[PDB]
Amino acid sequence: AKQRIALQRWQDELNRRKNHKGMIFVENTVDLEGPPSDFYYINEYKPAPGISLVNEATFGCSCTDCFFQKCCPAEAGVLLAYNKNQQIKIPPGTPIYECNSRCQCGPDCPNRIVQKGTQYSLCIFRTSNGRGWGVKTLVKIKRMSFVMEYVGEVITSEEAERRGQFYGITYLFDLDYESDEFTVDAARYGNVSHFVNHSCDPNLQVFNVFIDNLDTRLPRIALFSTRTINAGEELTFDYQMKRTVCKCVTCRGYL
Amino acid sequence: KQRIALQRWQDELNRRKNHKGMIFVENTVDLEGPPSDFYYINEYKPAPATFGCSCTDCFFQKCCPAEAGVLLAYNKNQQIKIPPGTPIYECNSRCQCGPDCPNRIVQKGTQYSLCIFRTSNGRGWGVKTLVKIKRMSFVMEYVGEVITSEEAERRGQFITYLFDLDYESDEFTVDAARYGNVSHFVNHSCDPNLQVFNVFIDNLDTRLPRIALFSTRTINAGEELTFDYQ
Numbered sequence: 001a002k003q004r005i006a007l008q009r010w011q012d013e014l015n016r017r018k019n020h021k022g023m024i025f026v027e028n029t030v031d032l033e034g035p036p037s038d039f040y041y042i043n044e045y046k047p048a049p050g051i052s053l054v055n056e057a058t059f060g061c062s063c064t065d066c067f068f069q070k071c072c073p074a075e076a077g078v079l080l081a082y083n084k085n086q087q088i089k090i091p092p093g094t095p096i097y098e099c100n101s102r103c104q105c106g107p108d109c110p111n112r113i114v115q116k117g118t119q120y121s122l123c124i125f126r127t128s129n130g131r132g133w134g135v136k137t138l139v140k141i142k143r144m145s146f147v148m149e150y151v152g153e154v155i156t157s158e159e160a161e162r163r164g165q166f167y168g169i170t171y172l173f174d175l176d177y178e179s180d181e182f183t184v185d186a187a188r189y190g191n192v193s194h195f196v197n198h199s200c201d202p203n204l205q206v207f208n209v210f211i212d213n214l215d216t217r218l219p220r221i222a223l224f225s226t227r228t229i230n231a232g233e234e235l236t237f238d239y240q241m242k243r244t245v246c247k248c249v250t251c252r253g254y255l
Numbered sequence: 256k257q258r259i260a261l262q263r264w265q266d267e268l269n270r271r272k273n274h275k276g277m278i279f280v281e282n283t284v285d286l287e288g289p290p291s292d293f294y295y296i297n298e299y300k301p302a303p304a305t306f307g308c309s310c311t312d313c314f315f316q317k318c319c320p321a322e323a324g325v326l327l328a329y330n331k332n333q334q335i336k337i338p339p340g341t342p343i344y345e346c347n348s349r350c351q352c353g354p355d356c357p358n359r360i361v362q363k364g365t366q367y368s369l370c371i372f373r374t375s376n377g378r379g380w381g382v383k384t385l386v387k388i389k390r391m392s393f394v395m396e397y398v399g400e401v402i403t404s405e406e407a408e409r410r411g412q413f414i415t416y417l418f419d420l421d422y423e424s425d426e427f428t429v430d431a432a433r434y435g436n437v438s439h440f441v442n443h444s445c446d447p448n449l450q451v452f453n454v455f456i457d458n459l460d461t462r463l464p465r466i467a468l469f470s471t472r473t474i475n476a477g478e479e480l481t482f483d484y485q
C-alpha cells in the first residue's frame with residue numbers, strides 16, 4: 001500500500017523530468033523495494049565542472065528531399081543512416097550525421113530521428129531473479145529503430161579511470177569513436193538506460209550521433225534495436241568490459 | 256570575505272537549478288553576504304487523473320486546451336495570446352507530440368540568464384535580466400512549499416512570501432519563505448513587468464495550479480524584474 005504510493009510518485013516525477021513522447025511506467029510485483037534516491041533523470045548530457053559541450057554547428061543542408069539529395073551525411077563524408085521508415089542501415093562504427101537547426105528541412109525530414117527523442121513507451125520494472133531493476137518495452141519495437149540515447153555526466157578519462165576503481169560492470173561509457181579524452185557516467189544522472197540490464201545477447205546497439213554537436217571527441221550515444229523487440233520483452237545492452245565470464249539465466253558463458 | 260562567499264552561493268544555485276540559463280550573483284553596493292536559510296528548488300515542494308491529446312499538429316487541431324474548454328495559450332512566436340485569468344493547459348507526458356510542440360513553453364524551464372543583485376536604495380536583494388526579454392513571454396515559475404489555507408494562516412501571523420493558489424479553490428497556498436527559485440528575490444512594484452498565469456501540465460486538478468510568470472511588456476537587458484504582491 002505504502003510501496004505502491006512511493007513507486008507511483010517516482011513514476012510521476014520521472015514523467016515530469018523527461019521531455020520525449022514515450023511514457024515511462026514503474027512496476028514492482030516482486031518485493032518491497034521502493035524508489036531509488038541514487039537517481040536524477042536528465043534528457044541530455046550533463047557537463048562536469050571543466051567540460052564545455054558547445055552545440056557549435058553553423059551550417060546545414062538546403063535539400064528539399066534529404067533522402068535523395070546529397071545531404072548533411074555527404075557533407076561529413078559518409079552515408080545517410082536511415083531508410084524512409086526510420087530504420088538505420090549503416091554498419092556499427094559508422095557515425096550518424098543528422099540534420100540540425102541550421103538545415104532548411106522541417107521536422108518530418110527522414111534524417112531527423114535521434115533528435116525527436118524516444119517514441120516508445122517503456123517500463124522500469126523489478127526483475128524476478130535478483131538482477132534488481134530492469135527496463136522493458138510496453139509496445140512493439142521495429143528492427144533497427146531508435147529507442148533512447150545513453151546520457152550521463154560527461155567526464156575526463158582520468159576521472160573515469162579513478163571512478164572505475166570503485167567496484168567490469170559499470171555506468172562508464174567511453175566516447176572513444178575517435179578520441180580517448182571523454183567518458184559518460186550515468187551512475188547519479190541519466191535517463192531510463194541507467195536501469196537497463198546486461199546481456200551477452202543484447203537487443204540494443206550503439207551509434208555515435210552528431211546533430212548540432214560536430215566535435216568528434218563528444219558524440220551523442222544513441223541505442224538502436226538489433227531485432228524486433230515485442231511488447232513485454234526486456235531491453236538489454238552488452239556493457240560488461242572485456243578469460244572473462246559473463247554475469248547476465250542462459251549465458252553464452254565467456255565474453 | 257564578502258566576495259568569496261557570494262560566488263560559493265552563486266555556484267550552489269547553479270548546481271541546484273535544472274534549467275538552461277545561468278544564475279548570477281552581484282553586489283557592488285554594500286557588504287552583506289548570502290542569506291542564511293534559503294534553499295533553492297525547481298518545482299513545488301509538498302508538505303506531508305490524466306489525459307493526453309493525439310494531435311499531429313497541436314497548433315491547429317483540437318488539443319489539450321480544447322479538452323478543458325479553453326484556447327491554445329501561445330502563437331507561432333511563443334508569446335502568450337490569452338487574457339489574464341485564462342488557464343494554460345500545456346501538452347504533457349501522455350500526449351502524442353514531442354518537445355517540438357508549440358504548446359510546451361512553461362515546462363521547458365527558465366529561458367533567460369538572471370542576476371540576483373543587491374539594490375542601491377535599501378530594498379535588499381533583487382532580480383534583473385542579463386538579456387532582452389520579449390513582451391508576453393515566459394520568464395520563470397513561482398515555486399515554494401505547498402501548504403493548506405489553515406497552515407498558511409498560522410505562518411502568515413509573522414509584503415509576504417505567501418501566494419494563494421485560488422484559481423478555482425481556497426485550499427492551497429504557496430510559501431516561498433525558506434524554499435524557492437530566483438522569484439523569491441523579485442521586488443515589489445505597483446507597475447510590475449511580470450504577471451501570473453495558472454498552468455496545468457501533468458496535473459489536471461484545478462486546486463493545484465502551477466504559477467508561471469510572464470512579462471507584461473518588453474524588458475531590456477539590465478532592467479529589474481518586479482511583481483505586484485501586497
Ligand SMILES: [Zn+2]
Binds near residue numbers: 099
Ligand atoms: Zn538535407
Ligand SMILES: [Zn+2]
Binds near residue numbers: 063066099105
Ligand atoms: Zn534534412
Ligand SMILES: [Zn+2]
Binds near residue numbers: 060062066072099100
Ligand atoms: Zn541537413
Ligand SMILES: [Zn+2]
Binds near residue numbers: 201
Ligand atoms: Zn551472458
Ligand SMILES: [Zn+2]
Binds near residue numbers: 319
Ligand atoms: Zn495536441
Ligand SMILES: [Zn+2]
Binds near residue numbers: 308313350358
Ligand atoms: Zn502538443
Ligand SMILES: [Zn+2]
Binds near residue numbers: 309350
Ligand atoms: Zn497535448
